[PDB]
Amino acid sequence: LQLVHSCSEQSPQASALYYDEFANLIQHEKLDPKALEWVGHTICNDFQDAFVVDSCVVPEGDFPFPVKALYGLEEYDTQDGIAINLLPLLFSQDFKLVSPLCLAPYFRLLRLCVERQHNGNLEEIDGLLDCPIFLTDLEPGEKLESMSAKERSFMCSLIFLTLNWFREIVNAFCQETSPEMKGKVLTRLKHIVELQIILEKYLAVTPDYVPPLGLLLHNSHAFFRELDIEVFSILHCGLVTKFILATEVVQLGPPELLFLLEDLSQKLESMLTPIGFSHLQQRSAQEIVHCVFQLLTPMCNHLENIHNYFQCLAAVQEYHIMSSCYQRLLQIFHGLFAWSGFSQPENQNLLYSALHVLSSRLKQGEHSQPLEELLSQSVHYLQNFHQSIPSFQCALYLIRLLMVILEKSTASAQNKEKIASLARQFLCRVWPNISNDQLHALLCIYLEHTESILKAIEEIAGVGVPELINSPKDASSSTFPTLTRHTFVVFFRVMMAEL
Question: What does the UniProt entry say about where the protein is found?
Fold first, then answer.
């Protein structure tokens, strides 16, 4: 083991691959106590000797940007001597055993190894968490119009490794069940979100330049390290509205909710609907659906709260941020209910346990009832949210959600009529832009589930297009308000295909 470690020490990519693969191996397999504690002791010694340093800052390499303490425990003081010097080492190597450019795998090994020895109870790793990182107060270059030079390229390179570190730290500390420390990991969310804003600003000013790592949508899954499903146990914590408004404790705001929920949606859509990911695939498809299933009650309570928020608003950037959060939340719910495993009879009781709670969400104290009735008030409960649907693309997801939870149903005709009625409600509604494929899917399901397809086609044609030629160019007000020039072609395509 130490032979292969020393041989692979020089190569950074091969080293990082060794660290990540060995960490996965330790995670998903059992090792003997002596070898496990030996490798844990050696890697802990190497990590302590390499990166951990005194709180006093010693600049090296004569870098031009002054460095101040940031991104640490709020009650931090100079007495706590722990600190990390990732940026001096990156500046030195950019401009041999130490390799902070692959810092994230190293900590993962530590995050496994002590957990094998101590069975949790990691005070030293909590000390590693509590320390800050000394870095310049980095901001976008527009304050001085920073040209994309070598120094700016290095600074933009630093953001990915900082985000990976602050992602793996919350990956590590999610499982800890102590109440006081919870806000600490929430502060890490509050860090990475602003860093993510900073990250996309560096994509805005320099879209062409891309730092390496072993447009932002493509780069996010590739660069950012994966996270365990247990990380989404942080979503068990309740949220609080920020724009409108556990005192003196951080709480789940909207954008960290969007971030975690979008990561969950990417993972769920990648798995359930057949690669960029390598950690989730090792876990099977049965325990993961159980893990997200036990989590559905908190995120459904979040759906309730944000729906009530939008109802209260019904009477700036946070509005569409929460709207996109709503979109992603409905996407999670549909994707969870769209698993192909529920078709086969293996996990029917799991599906039933998915929806009894929903029934308890609507009318408390009802259980062990027939499945068709329970899903009937479940679809009624989902239908109650149809008013608080700000973004248009959510609506079709909700309609699709209804269909899948109404796929496993008996009274097909009534369900189809209800789906058609709600689709008509969405279509006739005005909206404030919109991808044509969303119109394609929505009109497809609407015309499919209407009682008379041919009558509906002639009806939409006669009511709309005569009104369109009567109406002026841009305004396409009719029974169908969304019948503008950027929509007529998909309308014609959908009516022709359904005909």
Answer: Nucleus
